[PDB]
Amino acid sequence: LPELPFADLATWSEGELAWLREPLDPRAPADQRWVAGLPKIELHCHLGGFATHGELLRRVRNAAENPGKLPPLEEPRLPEGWPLPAQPIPLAEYMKLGNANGTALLRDPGCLREQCRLLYRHLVDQGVCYAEVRCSPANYAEVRSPWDVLADIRAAFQECMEGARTAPGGLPACHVNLILIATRRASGDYRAAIARHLALAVTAAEHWRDENACRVVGVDLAGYEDEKTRAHYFREEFTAVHRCGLAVTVHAGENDDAEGIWRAVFDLNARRLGHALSLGQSRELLRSVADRGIGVELCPYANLQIKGFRLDGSAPGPYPLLDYLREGVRVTVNTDNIGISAASLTDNLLLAARLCPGLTRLDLLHLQRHALETAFCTATQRLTLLRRISSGIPRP
Amino acid sequence: LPELPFADLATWSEGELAWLREPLDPRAPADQRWVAGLPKIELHCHLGGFATHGELLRRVRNAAENPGKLPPLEEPRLPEGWPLPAQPIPLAEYMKLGNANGTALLRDPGCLREQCRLLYRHLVDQGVCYAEVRCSPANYAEVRSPWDVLADIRAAFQECMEGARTAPGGLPACHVNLILIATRRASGDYRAAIARHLALAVTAAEHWRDENACRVVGVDLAGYEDEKTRAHYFREEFTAVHRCGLAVTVHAGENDDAEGIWRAVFDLNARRLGHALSLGQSRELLRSVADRGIGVELCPYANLQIKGFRLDGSAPGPYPLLDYLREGVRVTVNTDNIGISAASLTDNLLLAARLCPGLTRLDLLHLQRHALETAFCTATQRLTLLRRISSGIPRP
Amino acid sequence: LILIATRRASGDYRAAIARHLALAVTAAEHWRDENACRVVGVDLAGYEDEKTRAHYFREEFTAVHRCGLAVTVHAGENDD
Amino acid sequence: LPELPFADLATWSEGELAWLREPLDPRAPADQRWVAGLPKIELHCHLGGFATHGELLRRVRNAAENPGKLPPLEEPRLPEGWPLPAQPIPLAEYMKLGNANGTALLRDPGCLREQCRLLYRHLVDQGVCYAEVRCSPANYAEVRSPWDVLADIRAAFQECMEGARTPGGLPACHVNLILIATRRASGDYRAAIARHLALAVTAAEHWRDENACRVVGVDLAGYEDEKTRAHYFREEFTAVHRCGLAVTVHAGENDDAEGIWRAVFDLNARRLGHALSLGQSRELLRSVADRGIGVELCPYANLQIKGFRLDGSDAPGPYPLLDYLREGVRVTVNTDNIGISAASLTDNLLLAARLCPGLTRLDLLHLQRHALETAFCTATQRLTLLRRISSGIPRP
Amino acid sequence: ELPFADLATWSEGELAWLREPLDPRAPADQRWVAGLPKIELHCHLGGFATHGELLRRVRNAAENPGKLPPLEEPRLPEGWPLPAQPIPLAEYMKLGNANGTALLRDPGCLREQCRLLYRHLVDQGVCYAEVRCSPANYAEVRSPWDVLADIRAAFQECMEGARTAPGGLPACHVNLILIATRRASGDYRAAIARHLALAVTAAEHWRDENACRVVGVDLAGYEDEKTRAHYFREEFTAVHRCGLAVTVHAGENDDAEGIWRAVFDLNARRLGHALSLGQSRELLRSVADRGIGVELCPYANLQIKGFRLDGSDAPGPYPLLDYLREGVRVTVNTDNIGISAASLTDNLLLAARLCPGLTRLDLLHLQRHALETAFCTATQRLTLLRRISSGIPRP
């Protein structure tokens, strides 16, 4: 009782609690429907990887403003049993798998709004109550300016949000915010690109201030740390940017070095970390991360497809999800890429249950609580989401 | 009910909850009985200001190993109505008010051990379950070395621990940790002083690694932070400290400019702020402090005696406690100096209730939760203390 | 157009400087036609915020140069 | 005659004067006996390589307190004609040779005490009147804190000191301590350097007696993966300087002049390890000669590792000892690893005479005087040692 | 434990006499001191002849007399050699306005001043001196390089002219140390840079080890508040690689922080004055251990800061005996020969008067410290050691 993640669960029966304290069977239809009915919070999503195959690609391509400029349709072929491949693949082919929708197709003003609407519809269907889409406006800007792209994205999302307007008390069904990732065209001076990125983020944060609408809530740090020079440059940029009220998230990608995480935590003053699955090899770092309160984001399907991992209990190591939960770190489960990985949030949760045996049903609510506590919203929205999630859990 | 500060309160009578929601009456004997029996947590206590007057001074004085060099007995005269002085006084006189117990009396090992025993007995009488005592081993060492003084202090407190040993599961009644505060004699080269202090803290942290005994848990960047010289001295020395596994708790002093708090938060990587009564004039700083999760320590009696404030609804502004609680800042109530201010934790809480009208009884539990969350213990200790406080709340 | 700093040094002046330069850079990138009004430079007036509290954050002013903005400095009182 | 190293030699007449300026014969038993009785000073000795083979290893192994976990006895086989090998061997092989005594055997208090006693006895037997032993307490500590290891070492050496007590009440041989960095480059090196420096500072503060064992200086070397680490050391070594500790730098592989410049003028070193290539830059040699920095040379170790031509048979250049002495540099002769190299101080001096033809006995006396002048003792101890050395010289 | 080795060949009574307190007023000791070989390390060229006949001799050797400033000798205060009240440093500087820039902007005056200074140094019995000068001061039309070349040429001409016979070497070897300029009106950085560049170029130009050479620079006190912070960095780190020595003058205030910074950041090898070192034991121990010399001028210290004399009577006792006991390297110099109106012998005698109980062995100890602290080379060090050890007069 005293260690219950939510307070409403104290009104459940003893048998219901006993059921809740049992291992979860991922192949049971009842558990599938139960997980499907759960309200969820999503924190690691990419706008440029939503619809890369199937009917949705046709629907997106059929709404272009200039049909004569559309590139020819060429769907890449997925590897053997792509949802659960038998061999890990390098990141290059994983990125290449989504070449049918991205920079090539999102340069038409018509396609962008339709993609945003389809993503919002999918998010509403999944039952998510709060999401933070990540986009790079400069990529989809050749004849227009990045500000125009950002304004178009914000307008489309806000129009959808006002259009839905369900009744949890008059609020919209799903609140959506924005995070600005870096750019990929790092051929010229990366100093100019990073400066333009940060300046655009600051100006966008200042321009929109209404607390019940889309707001650029924080910058993303792709890092791309080829050399220490970027570390110094955006260290100074963050000495500039911390005063404007913007959150910082750092993606810990390849080689997952401990020195990089130390520098990111104690010099860039980050509040969330991306992936970074190698943390149990240094007790000091794990303890510091646990006590300070920095959240950690994990994507089951993407990690399995890229790095490769043991499944169903049968040389990759075990998935470090149960260890983090036992130690007290704040871990979350996200979808990363929806179109490339071809898996929704529910499938991600069930697969994460598969990777770590013995995961109980209470741990899903613990993950939701951690995601709620690690978000980038305000206190009023935090209490709102707490009330919503506390009273939405379906009983067995 | 979803915004409850605990989980045991769920199974409470509706009349009990309504009573909990009512404003607190500070002059009611029943409320005094209720606040007396509460389990408490203390985070701001000084060893050098425990017994500066009365029979305790006599008991400490007589227990000296070598009474030959005891300074002549003279108890300083307290000002008029010292519990609630009519007019503010500067901090210097407040410091001299406790000149009969300190450097002079503690240079004898027997006096040090007796004072430690008496402080532990007083704390266990007050009912606190976990306290953090600040001490400066340097000032109590003239012929001996700082290491000997620290070892003596640790041995005395651990002996009291292993003597008490109550039965919540075999654990002692009150856990006690140590925080090393910088020395006051700023006559010699301050670089050597701060270097010796930091090295002693690091070595003491390394030596004692047991998780169920007294151990140094953090350092204190005190007033002699060299803020005059080039905005302190960057982060050169602390870069070592953070990796070793120590905590930093900056103490805001006079003036209290926002720039100092900004630098302490974002350059010292601190986790707790001392006093800092002026935070409502800058919205950005308040929002950042609330979002990151940095705790704030407040002492009502000391603030009233030194700074001076209006009381019971009758130029300083209103006490910034209710505003901090509403905005989400993690505030705590402490005692600062027990003997100099002539007050305990219970009297401090009652005076805090008097200072801000309309303070409810629920906010006391909110303050206790905030104090518990921002302590310097481990996850297992945190869970044990949380269960203890949850099960120790007396019903009306 | 040239963007000078502001007068109200009430809040955090560093935040004001950062917002000033961010607005300048974004406006410079937004309008790029060479036959229309466009932000052409900034004025680090008031000596940024005077050497009393700001001196010269040289490492801060290395982004405006790469983005193609000119810098004008006002010499006010004293003029050492 | 003003060029005489000591005043006592001014009454030593024509016979001894003539006998002194002649080249020393290393194969004459009379010369060997004369060298044997000379008072000596040692400045480069390692505690971890004293007893590695033979009966001494047997005695050290026998005098243990937990024989149940003593690693099995295994002696690595020495290379061909090991005292004087015919071909140089790499440093890694040199380290591999002494694996019979080190981190394995010395994790037991009895073994450590026996090793200290045996080293003191051997040093007394040779005739050394002042030595500085380098040790790394962090290595010999798995279940004990480094402070316990340091206390054990100091207590053993002080007990032996007080036991000997032979020249006006002073002990037979004075011994001090120098803290050398560790070997395990697995964890963050920042933590290791911080712990090393803090332990050095605290140990220097604790024992302040002028007539007992005491930590006299830190070895600021053994770790130069990136010299930017040494740059951070430049940032934080003000502490160790102001605390009053000496600095010694070991320059081994490559031995670039830039590193020597940085060590001399940025780390403020007072002694240099090895550094066999200094005549290739006349400005550096002039600076080193003028400032007064000392240079440590180990003949047997340099011959075994780097390789040099004996008896002037002519390829690395000739041994730079004579040139260094002629130019004015302060060069000393040490044993480095007594056990692994299997050679005492007398053997080292005789081999130094053999390596560089034309060396005289007055040069040996000059070497001893330089070693005395470069030591890390105090002025009173300096004068006492000078008197003892001057009085102790035997006539042929 | 004797400063020199030749002293071991003296009779027992001579050593017993040498181990007795020195009487500064006995006519016997005054003649013994005057015959000792001496080493000078703190002398200024711009303050040598400022009063009396020497000023007239310098003035009568000008090249264009039509622009010579009119005669005006400043009036000395009450009992100038030994005043009753210390005077401020500024007034001390004003006392020697009869000589300096005004009279030394003439080439012939500079030549005659150099020759007279050499004559005086030879007369006093000095065997090695290091004159300090600031060539930027005496340059209104000619460049500083011309002034430096003229000074060096005059000194080398005198050195070759004397050429006595201790083994073919000159009677007195003279080197040069560059001082920062005084016209603190223009840009600070420009003056510092020109000073250092001139020093480096002069060091490179002259390399013969038997002639006048620029041996080091003086980094005085041109560093005030934040100039102090910034200048104390890489720009002084370059000159170490260039191959020069650095001496720092610590005058007024004399806070321990400045001495710490000078020792451990400027890598100095000599400290000027710095009479307050016993207030911080760690600093004194570090200075004694590293081997940095300290320069003390008795007459100037007494006339500026004021001090107790003859054991009688708020400045404390002179910190000369204490520094000697603690192991520091201490030296006795003349500072200004014209303003203070005293020579090396008088300075030594008054140093004996300042600290009662000073024996005759400490004088030779001071000479040994001066020899060990100088900026010569190893060959010169050995030659000077041999010269000094074979020149001490027996009682």
DSSP string, B350-373: HHHHHHSTT-BSHHHHHHHHHHHH
CA-CA distance, B246 to B264, in Å (whole number)?
16
E201 is in an annotated binding site: no
For residue B307, give how far its alpha carbon lies from the nearest alpha carbon of chain A (Å): 29
Token pair listed for D80: 């061909």
Give the largest CA-CA distance in chain E: 65
B188/E260 touch (CB, cutoff 8 Å), yes or no: no
The SS3 assignment for D20 reads helix
Contact yes or no, D with E (3+ CB pairs under 8 Å): yes
Token pair listed for D200: 């050095």
* Cβ-Cβ contacts under 8 Å, D202 against chain B: 147, 196, 199-200, 203
Q: D with E: how many residue pairs have Cβ under 8 Å apart? A: 49
Cβ burial D207-243 (10 Å sphere, 16+ → b, else e) = beeeeebbbbbbbbbbbeeeeeebeebeebbbbbbbb
Q: What are the helix (H) ranges across E65-222?
A: 89-94, 101-104, 107-124, 144-162, 188-205
CA-CA distance, B127 to B165, in Å (whole number)?
14
* CA-wise closest residue to A41 among A127, A168, A128: A128
Nearest-10 Cα torsion for A49, A54, A58, A64: 10
A122 is in an annotated binding site: no
Give residues with Cβ within 8 angstroms of E57, minimum separation 6.
E49, E112, E116
* Strand (E) or helix (H) holding E207: none
CA-CA distance, A44 to E288, in Å (whole number)?
64
* CA-wise closest residue to A351 among A303, A383, A393: A303
* CA-wise closest residue to E263 among E288, E239, E243: E288
Token pair listed for B17: 């909850």
Give residues with Cβ within 8 angstroms of B229, minimum separation 6.
none
For residue B188, give how far its alpha carbon lies from the nearest alpha carbon of chain E (Å): 8
C-alpha A141: how far from chain center: 23
Phi, psi of D262, deg, nearest 5: -65, -40
Q: What is the 3-state secondary structure (H, E, C) of D85-135?
A: CCCCCCHHHHHHHCCCCCCCCCCCHHHHHHHHHHHHHHHHHHCEEEEEEEE
For residue D187, give how far its alpha carbon lies from the nearest alpha carbon of chain A (Å): 8
Q: How many CA atoms lie within 13 A of E124 on its CB side?
A: 24
**Strands of the B247-251 sheet, one edge to the other:** B40-46, B128-135, B175-181, B216-220, B247-251, B272-274, B295-298, B330-333
The region, left, alpha or beta by phi > 0 then psi within -120 to 50, assigned to residue E214 is beta
Phi, psi of B298, deg, nearest 5: -130, 140
Token pair listed for E126: 């000095």
CA-CA distance, D205 to D199, in Å (whole number)?
10
Give residues with Cβ within 8 angstroms of E247, minimum separation 6.
E177, E216, E217, E218, E219, E268, E269, E270, E271, E272
* Cβ-Cβ contacts under 8 Å, D191 against chain A: 284
CA-CA distance, D268 to D234, in Å (whole number)?
9
Phi, psi of E284, deg, nearest 5: -65, -45
E256/B192 touch (CB, cutoff 8 Å), yes or no: no
CB atoms within 10 A of CB E82: 13
Task: Find out whether B128 and B41 touch, Cβ atoms under 8 Å.
Answer: yes
Chosen for mutation from E237, E241, E385 (greatest number of chain D CBs closer than 10 Å) is: E241
A336 is in an annotated binding site: yes
Q: What residues in chain E have their Cβ under 8 A from chain D's Cβ atoms? A: 1-2, 4-6, 8-9, 237, 240-241, 243, 245, 260, 264, 267, 269, 282, 285-286, 288, 290-291, 326-327, 378, 382, 385-386, 389
* Cβ-Cβ contacts under 8 Å, A198 against chain C: 22
* Strand (E) or helix (H) holding A80: none
Q: Which amino acid is at B302?
A: A
Give residues with Cβ within 8 angstroms of D300, minimum separation 6.
D83, D335, D336, D341, D343, D347, D348, D351
Phi, psi of E160, deg, nearest 5: -70, -30
* Cβ-Cβ contacts under 8 Å, A189 against chain C: 66
Task: Find out whether B375 and B43 touch, Cβ atoms under 8 Å.
Answer: yes
D196 is in an annotated binding site: no
Nearest CA in chain D to A260: D188
E218 is in an annotated binding site: yes
Nearest CA in chain B to E258: B189
Chosen for mutation from A202, A209, A243, A368 (greatest number of chain B CBs closer than 10 Å) is: A243
**Strands of the C70-72 sheet, one edge to the other:** C2-4, C41-43, C70-72
Token pair listed for A60: 């997106």
Nearest CA in chain A to B246: A288
Phi, psi of B188, deg, nearest 5: -80, -170
Token pair listed for E217: 């620079």
CA-CA distance, A240 to A246, in Å (whole number)?
11
- Write the CA distances from B168 to B161, B172, D93, integer angstroms: 14, 8, 58
| Beta strand E173-178 pairing with B175-181 | unpaired
E138 is in an annotated binding site: yes
CA-CA distance, D133 to A2, in Å (whole number)?
58
Q: How many CA atoms lie within 13 A of E338 on its CB side?
A: 25
Instruction: Concatenate the DSSP letters of all residues of B284-330 into one string.
Output: HHHHHHHHHT-EEEE-HHHHHHHT----TT----S-TTHHHHHHT-E
| Beta strand B295-298 pairing with D330-333 | unpaired
Phi, psi of D308, deg, nearest 5: -140, 160
Chosen for mutation from A229, A232, A244 (greatest number of chain C CBs closer than 10 Å) is: A244
D386/E1 touch (CB, cutoff 8 Å), yes or no: yes
Give residues with Cβ within 8 angstroms of B249, minimum separation 6.
B179, B218, B219, B220, B221, B270, B271, B272, B273, B274
Task: Find out whether B106 and B115 touch, Cβ atoms under 8 Å.
Answer: yes
A161 is in an annotated binding site: no
Task: Find out whether C54 and C47 touch, Cβ atoms under 8 Å.
Answer: yes
CA-CA distance, A309 to A313, in Å (whole number)?
10
Contact yes or no, B with C (3+ CB pairs under 8 Å): yes
Nearest-10 Cα torsion for D360, D364, D369, D374: 120
Nearest-10 Cα torsion for A85, A88, A90, A93: -10
D3-9 long-range contacts, Cβ below 8 Å, gap at least 24? D3/E382, D4/E5, D5/D362, D5/D365, D5/D366, D5/D368, D5/D369, D6/D365, D6/D369, D6/D386, D6/D389, D6/D390, D6/D393, D7/D390, D7/E1, D7/E2, D7/E5, D7/E8, D8/D390, D8/D391, D8/D393, D9/D365, D9/D393
C-alpha D13: how far from chain center: 34
For residue D116, give how far its alpha carbon lies from the nearest alpha carbon of chain E (Å): 29
Which chains pack against E, by 3+ Cβ pairs within 8 A? B, D
CA-CA distance, D200 to E261, in Å (whole number)?
23
Match 């000697």 to its residue by tokens: E324
Q: How many CA atoms lie within 13 A of D256 on its CB side?
A: 5
Nearest CA in chain C to B259: C12
* CA-wise closest residue to A395 among A15, A16, A3: A16
- Residue A353's Cβ-count burial label (10 Å; 0-12, 13-18, 19+) is buried
D174 is in an annotated binding site: no
Phi, psi of A205, deg, nearest 5: -65, -40
* Cβ-Cβ contacts under 8 Å, E233 against chain B: none
E8/D3 touch (CB, cutoff 8 Å), yes or no: no
For residue E274, give how far its alpha carbon lies from the nearest alpha carbon of chain B (Å): 18
DSSP C47: T
* CA-wise closest residue to D4 among D17, D23, D19, D22: D17
CA-CA distance, B24 to D29, in Å (whole number)?
99
Sign of CA dihedral B121, B125, B127, B133: negative
Nearest CA in chain C to B258: C12
E336 is in an annotated binding site: yes
* CA-wise closest residue to D120 among D156, D152, D165, D149: D156
CB atoms within 10 A of CB E164: 11
* Cβ-Cβ contacts under 8 Å, A146 against chain C: 29
Q: For chain A, after which residues does the C atom lie more than 2.5 Å from the next written residue's N, i.e. where is it broken?
A: 314
CB atoms within 10 A of CB A380: 11
CA distance between the termini of chain E? 21
Token pair listed for A376: 């980038």
| Beta strand B216-220 pairing with B247-251 | parallel
Give residues with Cβ within 8 angstroms of A17, minimum separation 6.
A9
* Cβ-Cβ contacts under 8 Å, E232 against chain B: none
* CA-wise closest residue to D340 among D63, D42, D85, D108: D85
Token pair listed for D239: 């502490």
For residue B200, give how far its alpha carbon lies from the nearest alpha carbon of chain E (Å): 20
A254 is in an annotated binding site: yes
Resolution of this structure in Å: 3.3
What radius of gyration, in Å, describes the C-alpha atoms of chain B? 21
* CA-wise closest residue to A381 among A176, A207, A184: A176
C15/B258 touch (CB, cutoff 8 Å), yes or no: no
- Write the CA distances from C67 to A191, A199, B304, C45, integer angstroms: 9, 11, 54, 20
* Cβ-Cβ contacts under 8 Å, B142 against chain D: none
* CA-wise closest residue to B82 among B67, B71, B98: B98
Triad D207, D208, D214: Cα angle to 5°: 60
Contact yes or no, B with E (3+ CB pairs under 8 Å): yes
| Beta strand D246-251 pairing with D215-219 | parallel
The SS3 assignment for E359 reads strand
The SS3 assignment for A42 reads strand
DSSP B139: G
Q: Which amino acid is at D50?
A: F
Q: What are the helix (H) ranges across A165-299?
A: 190-207, 228-241, 258-266, 283-292
Task: Find out whether E207 and E367 touch, Cβ atoms under 8 Å.
Answer: no
CA-CA distance, E78 to E84, in Å (whole number)?
8
CA-CA distance, E392 to E37, in Å (whole number)?
7
CA-CA distance, C23 to A202, in Å (whole number)?
8
- Write the CA distances from E63 to A17, B143, E103, E156, integer angstroms: 113, 73, 11, 21
Give residues with Cβ within 8 angstroms of D308, minimum separation 6.
D302, D316, D318, D319, D355
**Strands of the E270-273 sheet, one edge to the other:** E38-44, E126-133, E173-178, E214-218, E245-250, E270-273, E293-296, E329-332
Q: What residues in chain D have their Cβ under 8 A from chain E's Cβ atoms? A: 1-4, 7, 10-11, 238, 241-242, 244, 261, 265, 268, 270, 283, 286-287, 289-292, 327-328, 379, 383, 386-387
CB atoms within 10 A of CB D96: 12
CA-CA distance, E107 to E112, in Å (whole number)?
9
DSSP E142: S
D187/A259 touch (CB, cutoff 8 Å), yes or no: no
Task: Find out whether B165 and B120 touch, Cβ atoms under 8 Å.
Answer: no
For residue A336, give how far its alpha carbon lies from the nearest alpha carbon of chain C (Å): 30
CA-CA distance, C42 to E325, in Å (whole number)?
66
Q: Which of A192, A199, A243 sits opposite C26 (nearest CB)?
A: A199
- Residue E366's Cβ-count burial label (10 Å; 0-12, 13-18, 19+) is buried
The binding site of B for ATP comprises 46, 48, 95, 103, 136, 140, 183, 185, 254, 336-337
Nearest CA in chain E to D385: E1
Experimental method: cryo-EM
CA-CA distance, B36 to B28, in Å (whole number)?
12
Match 């080249």 to its residue by tokens: D23
